[PDB]
Amino acid sequence: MIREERLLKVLRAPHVSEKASTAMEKSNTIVLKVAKDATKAEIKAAVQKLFEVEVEVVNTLVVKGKVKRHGQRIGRRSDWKKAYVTLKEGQNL
Amino acid sequence: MKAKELREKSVEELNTELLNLLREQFNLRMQAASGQLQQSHLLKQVRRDVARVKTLLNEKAGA
Amino acid sequence: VLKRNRSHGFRARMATKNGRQVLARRRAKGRARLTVSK
Amino acid sequence: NNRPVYIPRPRPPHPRL
RNA sequence: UAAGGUGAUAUGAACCGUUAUAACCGGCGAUUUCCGAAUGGGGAAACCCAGUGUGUUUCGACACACUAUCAUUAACUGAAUCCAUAGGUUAAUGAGGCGAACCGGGGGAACUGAAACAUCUAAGUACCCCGAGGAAAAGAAAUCAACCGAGAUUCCCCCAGUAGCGGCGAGCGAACGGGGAGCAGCCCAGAGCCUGAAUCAGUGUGUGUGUUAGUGGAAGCGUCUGGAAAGGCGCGCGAUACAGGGUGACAGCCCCGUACACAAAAAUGCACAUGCUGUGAGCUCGAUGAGUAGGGCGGGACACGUGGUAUCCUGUCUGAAUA
RNA sequence: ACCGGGAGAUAGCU
RNA sequence: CGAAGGUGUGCUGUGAGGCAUGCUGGAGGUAUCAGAAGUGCGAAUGCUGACAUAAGUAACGAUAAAGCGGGUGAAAAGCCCGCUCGCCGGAAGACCAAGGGUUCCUGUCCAACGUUAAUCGGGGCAGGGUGAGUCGACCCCUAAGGCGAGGCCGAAAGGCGUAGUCGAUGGGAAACAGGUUAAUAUUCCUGUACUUGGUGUUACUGCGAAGGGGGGACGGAGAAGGCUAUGUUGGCCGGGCGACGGUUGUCCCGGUUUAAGCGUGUAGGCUGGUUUUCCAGGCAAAUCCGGAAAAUCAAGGCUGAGGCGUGAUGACGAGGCACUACGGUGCUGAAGCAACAAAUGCCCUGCUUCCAGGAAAAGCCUCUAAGCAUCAGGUAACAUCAAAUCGUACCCCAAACCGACACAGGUGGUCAGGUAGAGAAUACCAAGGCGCUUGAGAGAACUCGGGUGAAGGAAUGUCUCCACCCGAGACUCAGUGAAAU
């Protein structure tokens, strides 16, 4: 079954920011980058399997890429998706 | 390291693929994202190994 | 945007053989933006 | 980490930086 | 081939390997996201919504394959009336589109020339649609020729601005014949005799040839100018290799190259031999193409525009002979 | 009306 | 030990040209003889790049307009904060639609630009920010409309068109109060709950449609009232006590909030119901709809204002106070109530009439056809799970959208107050938004002179090392620095 490998692949990298730290310290949530699709059920299952923690609900959003001009040539950064996984009273990382 | 797993059975090579996908890949990407990874060739090596294992699995299973 | 897409979308072009010829000429001329779309 | 981006040599009327 | 590399802008950090699984090229394979004929349905292109059959960590929900049309074939169903038909369901074969030009078929103008303009020219050109092809079409006389003579078609040069057509104006313009590239003949309309009998189509093996990676491959030093010399001077050498590029100034003898000699594990097109499946030699006779020719009506191509107008076709009405 | 082709239409005229 | 090209000179020939040379140039040129030109430019309102003349002329970027004190900066009228002064205040205010794409905010410097400068900017560079069961899109159904399997027609082409299949600019399931970042908030939290479903337990039933009906269901106008948002009168609380007269007094200021849902469901109108029987039709079946008869009572349901409490000993809240790393956090919590008026907001798709009679389908609803009729199937209560995906920043009557310039013009709807005033008319004002661009030669980098300038005098400042001021050389106000020509 490729469910496990898909769950491993959906998670790409965490997101670090002042808002992320505030959310972690107050609301007990971790914000991390996810795959382009990264459906809620799949990301929740991947978090449960990998971080061996318990979560309440997961909501995600799409961040539109910025258009930057390198030299005289324009270019739009690739779109990336971020998900906020809310941990329960018991969290480890 | 290309013919070491060529003679391995389907189940054991699938288990090796699962191990490569889980360990040495998720941890490496997390370390790279956090900035704690000092060496980057490990990501390329593990990706190439996973691709080779997948190719061997496709060649063996089925045809 | 909806009206623009409906009146100049590639599907609307293909709906009539004339639009297919227009698309073929565009491809031959090698224009980067074949049609109007988001 | 990739701090260096290899900024290119700009135009004569370029941002003073 | 291999001791340099992780394609470039574009350096850097971190790495592989140096006698071979570093890196690069090539042949054979796998994967090949979504839209794109798009083909499960829809739609605003990279988006949304489903059914069926295969197996499964909390019923949770997942992964794979199928789900458009036409024509034909096979099978099962199948009313208006018994039978039947049409229609319906499943499986197999081929296509649905793109691609610069070339071929044929069906259409098809206007500007312009005649100093105008309606016949004509422009022109069966531009353009539109359909077909498969690598060439296409056509091709073995119901031909010319003249009563001397040739036996397929296509293309080139004369014939030839000739004869002819043409408000006999502008303009269009052959044919017979001669010389060249190339020459291949047959099949069905039907019976009997001997019956794989040559020629071909579809597939394996062997021989020669070419590509997809490539290998070897000769020969100059010192002095002067001079940023540096391939430049000047002196004396030597290779050449089946001074055809070309790079090298601080113009190089045969500095390097890549060139003449020349080789190289292929694997797939290849070409010319043959050897194996298998399919249609298929010659002998005797007959048959030898019917709604066709032709004719009346109005036109198109043959230079021939209806003029005395030969030939074919065209929509319509007629319409025999067949040796 | 616009776009491409006939078409570098023709023009006894500047 | 110097080709072509460029810049000057001297000769030479009737001429188009030729020769030699200094200078920058830097590696090609080429004697004589023969051959072809994309073979020689001064004009065709010729075409492309550059630059003078007018043109350093035209306005200064919307008549609300800014003045000052301080913080920064090298420099500040426009940069930051504060105090004053003027404006819109039914828009220049607050939202979303569309339209754009990160213009949102933190840090950073003015490379370039901003009708001057700008240290600021929607500038330029890095980093964050958009969290959707309850928002909208999305999806169910739909007409306007299309498309079109078969097929009909039609030289090809293509047009028509059934089955259907697409869609809204419409009808369908549901959220609010408060708190909360520099940027998000109904999707971030604190609670209340409301809806969507399937599956599992409970009880059994009568369930069961490309069928029946209602419903959806739709026009203008008129009295409107029972009310509410909203405001004002009182009202308690907190303060307070008055630099130019009085102002402990009916003196002055600030607040005195209502959620979504739960019921309660009232004024309202609507038409009568309760029952007995039979029966046409809606094709069909129906017991459902309805039609007619009869006895009875007048009740019948409809949603519905508001209302009350529950929600809710709700959060919020007069506030002052502890710090105030001086931006804010925290202490929390007093009153948090009555009357009037009143909406163009509800009841209200109401009611009433007026007239020509004012979409469509699906959802929603009972009987039910066949079929199933121990069951399957559904509701009722409980259980769990999940509610796919997409946008969520920012301008949005505007500097970011459509307008040839940060173009003066516009840009759909939506909330759109108080006073005087009947008047979303005006005039002025609360909150909110603002002040929407001016004035520069700086004497700057640097140059020179001086009135002069701390001291020693040889190092009167000419120097150890001095600076203010003045005279001059130094873009000038800076900008549309076009225009025909």
Side-chain angles (χ1 to χ4, degrees), chain B residues 6-35:
Chain B
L6 180 59
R7 61 182 61 85
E8 291 180 0
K9 298 191 297 183
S10 180
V11 300
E12 53 177 348
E13 66 181 353
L14 179 60
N15 297 329
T16 299
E17 185 192 10
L18 170 51
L19 294 177
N20 288 278
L21 291 173
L22 205 177
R23 297 76 162 181
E24 200 65 3
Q25 181 68 358
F26 183 81
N27 301 328
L28 287 190
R29 62 175 58 181
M30 293 292 291
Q31 291 293 90
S34 60

Side-chain angles (χ1 to χ4, degrees), chain A residues 1-6, chain B residues 14 18:
Chain A
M1 197 65 182
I2 64 178
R3 170 62 71 87
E4 55 85 7
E5 67 82 14
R6 193 73 185 91
Chain B
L14 179 60
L18 170 51

Side-chain angles (χ1 to χ4, degrees), chain A residues 6 8 14 26 29 46 50-51 63-64 67 80 92:
Chain A
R6 193 73 185 91
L8 266 294
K26 183 174 178 60
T29 70
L50 301 180
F51 300 157
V63 182
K64 281 58 175 176
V67 182
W80 55 285
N92 302 329

Side-chain angles (χ1 to χ4, degrees), chain B:
Chain B
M1 197 286 294
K2 62 185 186 179
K4 280 62 173 180
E5 72 288 359
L6 180 59
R7 61 182 61 85
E8 291 180 0
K9 298 191 297 183
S10 180
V11 300
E12 53 177 348
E13 66 181 353
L14 179 60
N15 297 329
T16 299
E17 185 192 10
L18 170 51
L19 294 177
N20 288 278
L21 291 173
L22 205 177
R23 297 76 162 181
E24 200 65 3
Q25 181 68 358
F26 183 81
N27 301 328
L28 287 190
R29 62 175 58 181
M30 293 292 291
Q31 291 293 90
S34 60
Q36 313 306 330
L37 181 63
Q38 306 298 348
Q39 49 184 357
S40 60
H41 65 285
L42 279 294
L43 290 170
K44 184 183 293 184
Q45 189 65 10
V46 65
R47 181 173 61 268
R48 297 293 177 85
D49 298 0
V50 170
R52 177 180 298 92
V53 173
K54 284 251 289 177
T55 302
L56 294 175
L57 273 162
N58 181 270
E59 186 278 346
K60 185 181 294 302

Side-chain angles (χ1 to χ4, degrees), chain A residues 50-73:
Chain A
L50 301 180
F51 300 157
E52 63 273 343
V53 296
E54 49 281 4
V55 308
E56 303 177 5
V57 61
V58 189
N59 49 15
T60 182
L61 66 85
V62 182
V63 182
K64 281 58 175 176
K66 297 181 178 180
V67 182
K68 300 297 184 181
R69 307 183 63 268
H70 178 270
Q72 83 303 344
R73 193 172 303 277

Side-chain angles (χ1 to χ4, degrees), chain C residues 1 4 6 10-11 13 15 17-20 27 29-32 34-35 37:
Chain C
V1 169
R4 186 187 186 89
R6 187 176 299 179
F10 83 99
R11 311 190 68 80
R13 299 292 184 178
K17 64 183 296 302
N18 313 325
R20 184 175 295 93
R27 291 188 180 90
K29 193 176 186 183
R31 301 181 65 88
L34 185 61
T35 58
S37 299

